[PDB]
């Protein structure tokens, strides 16, 4: 109905990256994904892959019964090393984007304050101008502390 | 006005197993088998689409 924020789901509409943002100032909607950390994630994610795939490959029935032994081991050996990095690929994701929260609670300060759900309503009105600076990591706050300090009044 | 931080979702029906959990649907993964026939490895994130 409305939109979202993390807590209750991811964003089908955001396609520019794994992680990223979207804003609604009075101009209009528009999903904008974070190239910043979507990249350095993938790079490591990519590095986890080959690091996994680097491990693939090192009396008649004796030979067979052995052949089937390491057909057995290796095949579960893999299964072992699949569930592992899979789970920890997935704590790596959720980690990053709570890190992509500290993102600007260490920047948006007290100008918006947690809606709870993972969104923010500004004591400001933040145009393209402004969300871009957030996205840039630019977001100053001598900005216009004052009005928000006033706007705070609410 | 508002700004939200979000993660990707899509219409992928692909699933993987983790140590802790089974058949989780995720947006993207690569299949390693160029034996027991179960070796999908995740690259994407947990697939949890909004709704509308």
């Amino acid at each position, epitope marked *: 109905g409305a939109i979202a924020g993390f807590t209750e789901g991811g964003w089908t509409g955001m396609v520019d*990256g794994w992680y990223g943002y979207h804003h609604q100032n009075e101009q209009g909607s528009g999903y904008a994904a974070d190239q910043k950390s979507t990249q350095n994630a993938i*790079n490591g*994610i990519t590095n986890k892959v080959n690091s996994v795939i680097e491990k693939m490959n090192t009396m008649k029935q004796i030979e067979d019964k052995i052949e089937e032994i390491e057909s057995k081991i290796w095949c579960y050996n893999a299964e072992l090393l699949v569930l592992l990095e899979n789970e920890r690929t997935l704590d790596f994701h959720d980690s990053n984007v709570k890190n992509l929260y500290e993102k600007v609670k260490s920047q948006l300060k007290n100008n918006a304050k947690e809606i709870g759900n993972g969104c923010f309503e500004f004591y400001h009105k933040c145009n393209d101008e402004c969300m871009e600076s957030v996205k840039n990591g630019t977001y100053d706050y001598p900005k216009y502390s004052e009005e928000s300090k006033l706007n705070r009044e609410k | 006005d508002t700004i939200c931080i979000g993660y990707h979702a899509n219409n992928s029906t692909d699933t993987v197993d983790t140590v802790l959990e089974k058949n989780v649907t995720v*947006t993207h*993964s690569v299949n390693l088998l160029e034996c027991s026939a179960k070796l999908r490895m995740v*690259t994407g994130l947990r697939n949890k689409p909004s709704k509308q």
Partner: antibody, heavy 121, light 110 residues
Framework: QVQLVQSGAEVKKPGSSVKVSCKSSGGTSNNYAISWVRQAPGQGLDWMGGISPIFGSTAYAQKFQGRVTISADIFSNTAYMELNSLTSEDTAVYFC??????????????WGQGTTVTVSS | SALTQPPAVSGTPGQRVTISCSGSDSNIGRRSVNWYQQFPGTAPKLLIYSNDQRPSVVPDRFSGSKSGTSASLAISGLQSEDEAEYYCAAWDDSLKGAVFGGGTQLTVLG
């Protein structure tokens, strides 16, 4: 020292199909988006589509949609492009290109030698 | 094709000449443009990305600007080895695809 090495030139008669490979030699490009762009002889560049294997995106140009399949093998660091129902207009030189990042907005910074594909009865 | 380039340009050695690229709101208007170089029978090389940004190998004599719905590139101290065709490029959100200009053929005063 990464370089993209494409398969050699191929020629097939119309209505048949062709698969072109692009190997990332000297490293992997899996963490990058790779696009396929075609240049017909003495003509401009034309985006066909792209794939970002680890990211999980595969994209297609609208005109070539449904006729082209782009794929990657992460193990071999090789990306493949396959076109179907060839006609004379599909005769061209086909390049593989790597974007600056995981996505297609970024500039294409490593280019294959190019592969010539000729459609002739 | 979505992006607009003059078919051919000419310059004298040492002069500055500029080539323009006009798009619509769907491409350059909201996204960055990349432009490419082609010498005959060989693959392209990337000269500029992210509008005005320049790659490590490329000479400072190439430099860029883009405005509004159009972009243009100036080559200063034009030299003979520069003789080649260069293409504008951008992401298009309507197409959800990459687009290229028609291409511009540069000639150096013989």
């Amino acid at each position: 020292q990464v370089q993209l090495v494409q398969s050699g030139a191929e020629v097939k008669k119309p209505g048949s199909s062709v698969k072109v490979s692009c190997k990332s030699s000297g490293g992997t490009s899996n963490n990058y988006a790779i696009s396929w762009v075609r240049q017909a002889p003495g003509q401009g560049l034309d985006w066909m589509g792209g794939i970002s294997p680890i990211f999980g995106s595969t994209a297609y140009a609208q005109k070539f949609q449904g006729r082209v399949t782009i794929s990657a093998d992460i193990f071999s660091n090789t990306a493949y492009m396959e076109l179907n129902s060839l006609t004379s207009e599909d005769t061209a030189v086909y390049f593989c290109a790597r974007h600056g990042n995981y996505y297609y907005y970024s500039g294409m910074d490593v280019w294959g030698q190019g592969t010539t594909v000729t459609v002739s009865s | 094709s979505a992006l607009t380039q003059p078919p051919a340009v000419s310059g004298t050695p040492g002069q500055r000449v500029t080539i323009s690229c006009s798009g619509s709101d769907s491409n350059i208007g909201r996204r960055s443009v990349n432009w490419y170089q082609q010498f005959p029978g060989t693959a392209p090389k990337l000269l500029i990305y992210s509008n005005d940004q320049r790659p490590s190998v490329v000479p400072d004599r190439f430099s860029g600007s883009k405005s509004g719905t159009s972009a243009s590139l100036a080559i200063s101290g034009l030299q003979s080895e520069d003789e080649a065709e260069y293409y504008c490029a951008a992401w298009d959100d309507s197409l959800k695809g990459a687009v290229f200009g028609g291409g511009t053929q540069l000639t150096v005063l013989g």
